[PDB]
């Protein structure tokens, strides 16, 4: 399977890094023309894009991070929001994917709203703004690490944790407030207990240092989001997780209870 020599150092490093590549929390409030709503729209659209080209979730997890970061220091008009979106994704794909889609492809998927030079120039601007700091931790990196503590590793929980993290990305507030490791922390446990009833493992407390007490504020926010899933205007993410690939996990009923 693997030689797991560096799990500890690696986990350590991503915890150190996730602090540094963290976007600014109330940034949308500063932004003259864009709203949390607009951003949800953007993320949702990014999600279909990922499906159409069979892209990694990791790819879009990075993409999202790149946007929040970029929009943290660069004022942008709604007219141009989608383009920041597309360049972000192209960079992500470039960094992560084995076979990233051609520049051509990306221009295609924009309603032909923007030219190619537009997209390529934006690509460059984003790199300038992020100062080439693209190697960022995401929720997925944490989950995938966390998943190793599971015996026997259970498909449904995994596909549900992945699903939940993704949901968080649609919502700026409240989720910009939480570090990826905590978003992962929450989703994992929330999945685990919807599916097997079982508990955030003692094992992970020892690795992460997180207790259920320490995760509670997040979980409260996350539960209601799962609850009101079918009323949110963003639907693509749900539809994605209905397939035989992901064991139709969006169709389950969220738990009544958490013992509050």
């Amino acid at each position: 399977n693997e030689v797991p020599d560096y799990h500890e150092d690696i986990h350590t490093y991503l915890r150190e890094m996730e602090v540094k590549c963290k976007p600014k929390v109330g940034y949308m409030k500063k932004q003259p023309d864009i709203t949390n709503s607009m951003r949800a729209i953007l993320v949702d659209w990014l999600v279909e894009v990922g499906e159409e080209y069979k892209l990694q979730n990791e790819t879009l997890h990075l993409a999202v991070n790149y946007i929040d970061r970029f929009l943290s220091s660069m004022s942008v008009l709604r007219g141009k929001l989608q383009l920041v979106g597309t360049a972000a994704m192209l960079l992500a794909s470039k960094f992560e994917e084995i076979y990233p889609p051609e520049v051509a492809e990306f221009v295609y998927i924009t309603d032909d709203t923007y030219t190619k030079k537009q997209v390529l120039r934006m690509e460059h601007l984003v790199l300038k703004v992020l100062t080439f700091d693209l190697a960022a931790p995401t929720v997925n990196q944490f989950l995938t690490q966390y998943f190793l503590h599971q015996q026997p590793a259970n498909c449904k929980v995994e596909s549900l944790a992945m699903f939940l993290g993704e949901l968080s990305l649609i919502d700026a507030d409240p989720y910009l407030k939480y570090l990826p490791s905590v978003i992962a922390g929450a989703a994992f446990h929330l999945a685990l207990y919807t599916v097997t009833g079982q508990s955030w493992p003692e094992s992970l407390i020892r690795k992460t240092g997180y207790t259920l007490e320490s995760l509670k504020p997040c979980l409260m926010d996350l539960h209601q989001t799962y609850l009101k899933a079918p009323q949110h205007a963003q639907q693509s993410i749900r539809e994605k997780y209905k397939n035989s690939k992901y064991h139709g996990v969006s169709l389950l009923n969220p738990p009544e209870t958490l013992n509050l």
């Binding site: 030689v3 890094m17 990694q56 990791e58 960094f95």
Partner: protein, 299 residues
């Protein structure tokens, strides 16, 4: 933008950009510039540049080449690295007659392993270790270079790019076409480089995919599910492989003592999980006396 720098000569290529030797006119710093074009095929900023830059910023270590600046021009992109005396290849080539002094090898290998464990702990796989990509100074240190092929990995690793490494230093699992490769691959390479510093000739001078694999088998023996649990249900594995018997190591590495060949052996285990880590290798008894010799030039 470059009005500060004076090109002296081209030093080489690797075909990805070109590499010039520059001096700062103001400070007199001597640097290695790596020039990169972007208006290649209207395909944006190249992947092999994006990854190198972003990971080399994350990586600061004494045995990993220093990236000093990155200069943004509209059509070119210059990377400024620290400048070193030569690469291990042309030094072995020079030292070819005498052969490499015994403890200078031990030193270099030790340092190289310090560097690789840094990479691995920052979730970076190098993937193109070879004497051309390892630079030495005059001060007796050696640095890893050319992270053009490197990539950041996940834990556990996903399926990553197949066409990797250089063939002479390529590991079995990749030759055999496996769906998941890990840290193990870099170690294999460093293994072959260790052997090459010692014997004076490359370990597996293969001419093709199949030829490379057999060259390995003919030394280390063809493997079975004992030596390598999983080998037989791998993607490009073929039951009609010849059955070569493994051979004696003092026959393979004649100048090595018991310890060195103990070490080397573990760096070359068919099984990736079994293959020694960079970390674990650092604690190996062979490094007991490790000191820091200085090489002769006359350049």
């Amino acid at each position: 933008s470059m009005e500060n720098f004076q090109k002296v000569e081209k030093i080489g290529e690797g075909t990805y950009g070109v590499v010039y030797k520059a001096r700062n006119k103001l400070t007199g710093e001597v640097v290695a510039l790596k020039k990169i074009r972007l208006d290649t095929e209207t395909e944006g900023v190249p992947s092999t540049a994006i990854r190198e830059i972003s990971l080399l910023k994350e990586l600061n270590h004494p045995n990993i080449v220093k990236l000093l600046d990155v200069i943004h021009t509209e059509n070119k992109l210059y990377l400024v690295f620290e400048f070193l005396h030569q690469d291990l290849k042309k030094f072995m080539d020079a030292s070819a007659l005498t052969g490499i002094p015994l403890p200078l090898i031990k030193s270099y290998l030790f340092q190289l392993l310090q560097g690789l464990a840094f990479c691995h702990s920052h979730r970076v796989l190098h993937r193109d270790l070879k004497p051309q990509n390892l630079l030495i100074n005059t001060e007796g240190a050696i640095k890893l270079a050319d992270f053009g092929l490197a990539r950041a990995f996940g834990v556990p690793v996903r399926t990553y790019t197949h066409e990797v490494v250089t063939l002479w230093y390529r590991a079995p699992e990749i030759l055999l076409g496996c769906k998941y490769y890990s840290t193990a691959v870099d170690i294999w390479s460093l293994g072959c480089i260790f052997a090459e510093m010692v014997t004076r000739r490359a370990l597996f001078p293969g001419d093709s995919e199949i030829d490379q694999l057999f060259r390995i088998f003919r030394t280390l023996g063809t493997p079975d599910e004992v030596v390598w649990p999983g080998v037989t249900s791998m993607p490009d594995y073929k039951p009609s492989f010849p059955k070569w018997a493994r051979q004696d190591f003092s026959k393979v590495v004649p100048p090595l003592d018991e310890d060195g060949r103990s070490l080397l052996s573990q760096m070359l285990h068919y099984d990736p999980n079994k293959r020694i880590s960079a970390k674990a290798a650092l604690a190996h008894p062979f490094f007991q006396d490790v000191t820091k010799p200085v090489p002769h030039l006359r350049l």
